[PDB]
Amino acid sequence: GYLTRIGLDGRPRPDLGTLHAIVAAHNRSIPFENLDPLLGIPVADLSAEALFAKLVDRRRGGYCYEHNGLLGYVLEELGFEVERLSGRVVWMRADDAPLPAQTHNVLSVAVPGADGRYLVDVGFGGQTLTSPIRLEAGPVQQTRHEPYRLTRHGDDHTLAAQVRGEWQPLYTFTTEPRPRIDLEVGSWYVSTHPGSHFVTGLTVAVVTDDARYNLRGRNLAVHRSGATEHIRFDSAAQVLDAIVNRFGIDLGDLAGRDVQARVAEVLDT
Amino acid sequence: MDLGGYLTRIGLDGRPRPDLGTLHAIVAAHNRSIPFENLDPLLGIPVADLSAEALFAKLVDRRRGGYCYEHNGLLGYVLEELGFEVERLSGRVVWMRADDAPLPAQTHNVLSVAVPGADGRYLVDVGFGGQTLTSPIRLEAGPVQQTRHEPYRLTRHGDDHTLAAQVRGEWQPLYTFTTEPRPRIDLEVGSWYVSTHPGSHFVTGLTVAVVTDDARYNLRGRNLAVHRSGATEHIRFDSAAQVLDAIVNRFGIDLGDLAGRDVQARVAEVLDT
Numbered sequence: 001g002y003l004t005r006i007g008l009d010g011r012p013r014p015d016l017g018t019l020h021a022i023v024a025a026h027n028r029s030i031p032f033e034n035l036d037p038l039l040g041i042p043v044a045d046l047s048a049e050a051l052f053a054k055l056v057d058r059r060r061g062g063y064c065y066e067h068n069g070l071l072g073y074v075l076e077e078l079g080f081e082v083e084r085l086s087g088r089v090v091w092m093r094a095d096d097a098p099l100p101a102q103t104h105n106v107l108s109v110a111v112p113g114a115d116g117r118y119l120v121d122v123g124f125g126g127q128t129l130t131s132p133i134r135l136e137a138g139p140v141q142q143t144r145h146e147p148y149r150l151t152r153h154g155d156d157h158t159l160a161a162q163v164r165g166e167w168q169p170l171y172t173f174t175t176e177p178r179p180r181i182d183l184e185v186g187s188w189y190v191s192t193h194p195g196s197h198f199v200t201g202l203t204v205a206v207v208t209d210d211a212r213y214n215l216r217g218r219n220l221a222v223h224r225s226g227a228t229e230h231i232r233f234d235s236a237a238q239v240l241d242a243i244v245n246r247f248g249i250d251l252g253d254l255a256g257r258d259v260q261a262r263v264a265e266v267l268d269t
Numbered sequence: 270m271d272l273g274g275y276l277t278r279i280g281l282d283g284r285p286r287p288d289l290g291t292l293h294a295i296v297a298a299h300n301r302s303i304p305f306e307n308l309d310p311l312l313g314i315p316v317a318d319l320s321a322e323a324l325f326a327k328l329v330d331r332r333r334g335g336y337c338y339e340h341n342g343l344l345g346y347v348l349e350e351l352g353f354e355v356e357r358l359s360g361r362v363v364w365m366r367a368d369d370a371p372l373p374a375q376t377h378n379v380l381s382v383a384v385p386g387a388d389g390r391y392l393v394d395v396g397f398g399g400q401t402l403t404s405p406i407r408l409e410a411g412p413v414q415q416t417r418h419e420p421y422r423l424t425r426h427g428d429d430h431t432l433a434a435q436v437r438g439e440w441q442p443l444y445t446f447t448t449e450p451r452p453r454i455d456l457e458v459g460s461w462y463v464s465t466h467p468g469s470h471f472v473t474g475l476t477v478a479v480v481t482d483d484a485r486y487n488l489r490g491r492n493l494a495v496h497r498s499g500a501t502e503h504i505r506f507d508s509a510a511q512v513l514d515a516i517v518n519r520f521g522i523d524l525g526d527l528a529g530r531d532v533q534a535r536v537a538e539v540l541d542t
């Protein structure tokens with residue numbers, strides 16, 4: 001189901017090329033969305049059963065713990081070695097802003113035939129990595145889209161991307177592997193705390209070969225070369241239509257919740 | 270006069286009867302086919318000659334667009350050739366002006382058309398740009414009239430008629446005009462002003478527009494706005510290179526026509542004006 005979900009064909013071999021191919025296909029096939037937290041449905045269970053059920057069988061997307069959770073289990077089953085890492089999102093944050101919570105989950109992946117480790121992150125939303133990169137401080141690393149770079153200060157790593165010119169820090173992380181329960185505590189926080197960006201509004205995102213799409217409330221942003229594109233939807237009806245048809249999210253397991261009404265309340269949050 | 274060339278330019282064919290159904294079809298075909306654009310004035314090339322020969326050579330033979338005098342000029346000659354009776358009218362653009370702002374210059378030209386088989390006259394205007402009329406409407410003050418897009422309304426005070434459009438729920442006055450028919454030379458004096466005065470909107474920046482069944486497209490400098498049913502899009506081009514690509518490939522305008530003028534360098538000066 002997963003391979004089909006992402007449009008790949010059989011069982012691929014556990015090597016570096018496969019990692020590049022699964023990331024690409026994951027990127028364009030499973031959207032980032034927070035419809036469950038938006039509707040008061042916690043993301044509490046990060047088991048394989050729960051994640052496969054939601055992101056594969058029911059054709060929903062999810063946020064970082066759901067995406068990277070799922071990819072983690074997929075890659076393990078193919079024969080990669082996978083450690084789950086946690087980090088703090090520093091994107092666009094004022095210098096001297098307080099230390100952010102650990103709200104992001106990424107993968108450190110070891111690949112038979114390769115020597116070190118790879119940062120894999122398909123769950124960061126509209127600016128997520130679209131290639132695995134080497135878990136190596138220093139070099140500017142090319143991806144399918146913009147250049148990225150890791151730096152290191154002690155045991156803290158920062159991922160930065162060169163976005164429309166500028167070098168922007170995205171998040172910091174340590175390479176300490178996390179047990180699933182510690183990820184579940186963080187996911188409980190991100191999906192239920194009243195000040196979470198994922199509780200107060202709607203975020204949907206996906207990445208094709210040519211563009212990064214990012215929807216917040218009524219505002220769809222599209223980033224491609226030479227141009228930034230901003231679509232403002234008139235009402236919740238158009239936003240749902242974009243959720244279902246543009247972003248490919250199946251709303252069937254949410255039957256009996258007033259999705260449109262909730263979306264209407266968060267068009268401008 | 271090359272009637273068949275014009276009809277071909279606008280995606281039509283045959284020779285239609287001079288009736289109301291034909292007036293609607295030619296307006297909708299012109300709206301989607303011949304863009305609003307001011308490249309000539311932007312590049313210091315005046316729009317001075319409003320003869321049928323000049324407007325046909327530019328807007329039909331050369332696959333350029335133009336601004337109001339050129340559009341409604343061309344359409345006016347086509348419409349007489351088909352057997353409509355046509356008067357050219359001038360007006361003053363009031364779109365978004367303060368209540369206290371000085372009287373505007375007469376910088377807009379529209380058509381008042383008698384249609385065989387219909388009572389009264391029709392206002393026809395394919396030349397106002399992205400918010401131009403997409404149907405002929407009855408030149409009748411009072412009622413709200415439907416078009417292929419938004420409701421529009423004419424009101425009257427003295428010898429001034431105001432055209433307003435209901436734009437996303439809000440009534441906006443576009444321009445005022447009188448029904449005094451204008452000779453070509455009065456239009457030409459107006460077009461001279463609009464295409465050469467250093468404070469003209471069409472001299473200090475770039476405006477490109479086209480209207481399809483589903484959307485109004487409006488480009489000012491680097492910003493492309495698209496109004497569709499249920500959404501607006503705002504595309505911001507990074508530089509003049511992307512703006513030219515839009516002009517050529519999205520709006521279908523042939524720039525080979527302006528060779529030797531460095532279009533890109535001039536558009537690079539007006540991305541934000």
Ligand SMILES: N=NC(=O)c1ccncc1
Pocket residue numbers: 063064065089103104105123124125190
């Ligand atoms: N779960 N957290 C996330 O998905 C996330 C948090 C912050 N920024 C992008 C993504």
Ligand SMILES: N=NC(=O)c1ccncc1
Pocket residue numbers: 336337338362376377378396397398463
């Ligand atoms: N010639 N004038 C025009 O083309 C025009 C003037 C004002 N607003 C839109 C279009």
